[PDB]
Amino acid sequence: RQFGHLTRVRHVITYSLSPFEQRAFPHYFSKGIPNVLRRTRACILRVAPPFVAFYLVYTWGTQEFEKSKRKNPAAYENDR
Amino acid sequence: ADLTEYLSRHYKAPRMVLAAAGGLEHRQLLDLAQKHFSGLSGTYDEDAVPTLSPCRFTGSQICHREDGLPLAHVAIAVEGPGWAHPDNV
């Protein structure tokens, strides 16, 4: 496991450019924000709904905890 | 058409040199050049005279990966001086 003994690669050509010759942030807001959005659209459907379902169970459970904490109308009413 | 146009443009007298070396008399070479080479045209059509625009050197890499070949060949270089520069020495 070293550079030279990794694997057999053939017929590939890699064109590169010096970091001083090229830019650091090439088309960052131009090409990026769309690419970021595309990536968000790809994942969102798989990622979000469980956290939404958590939020629903969270607020509901806290709501129902506050309901059960509070008074009830059958506590000695219509019973003097 | 391309070959003949390339010839007609670039192969001309002011862009050319006749060199010689050995046992020969400069006067005689000049007579031979006058007698045979003076038939070449001596300037342009007022355009078509290409002059060299300077070439941009770019620090960069090219890596033709090919494991089938027996020995790796590497060539690394920085930007050169040009023919004129005394630094060459």
How near does any CA of chain A get to the CA of B85, in Å? Answer: 24
Query: Quick check: helix, strand or coil at residue B3?
Result: helix
How far apart (Å, rounded) are the C-alpha atoms in residues B9 and B50?
Answer: 8
Of B59, B63, B66, the CB nearest to A10: B66
The CB density around residue B32, as the number of other CB atoms within 10 Å, is 13
CATH classification of A1-80, choosing from 3.40.50.1100, 1.20.5.210, 2.40.30.110, 2.60.40.10? 1.20.5.210
Whether the Cβ atoms of residue B65 and residue A13 lie closer than 8 Å to each other: yes
CA atoms within 13 A on the CB side of A28: 3
- Residue B9 φ then ψ, to 5°: -65, -65
Residue B88 vs residues A8, B83, B84: alpha-carbon distances, Å? 42, 8, 8
Dihedral sign computed on CA atoms, order B30, B31, B32, B37: positive
Name which of B7, B1, B89, B3 is nearest B48 in CA terms: B7
Nearest CA in chain A to B61: A16
DSSP state of B40: S
Interchain CB contact of B60 with A (< 8 Å): yes
- Token pair for residue A40? 């968000």
Whether the Cβ atoms of residue B50 and residue B44 lie closer than 8 Å to each other: no
β-pair partners for A10: B66
Interchain CB contact of B59 with A (< 8 Å): yes
The residue whose two tokens read 């770019």 is B58
Name which of A10, A25, A5, A21 is nearest B61 in CA terms: A21
How far apart (Å, rounded) are the C-alpha atoms in residues B56 and B61?
Answer: 15
Residue A66 vs residues A55, A71, A73, A77, B65: alpha-carbon distances, Å? 16, 10, 15, 21, 68
Query: Buried b / exposed e across A4-17, counting CB within 10 Å, b at 16+?
Result: eeeeeeeeeeeeee
Residue B62 vs residues A6, A11, A13, A37: alpha-carbon distances, Å? 20, 13, 7, 33
How far apart (Å, rounded) are the C-alpha atoms in residues B66 and A71?
Answer: 80
How far apart (Å, rounded) are the C-alpha atoms in residues A79 and A77?
Answer: 5
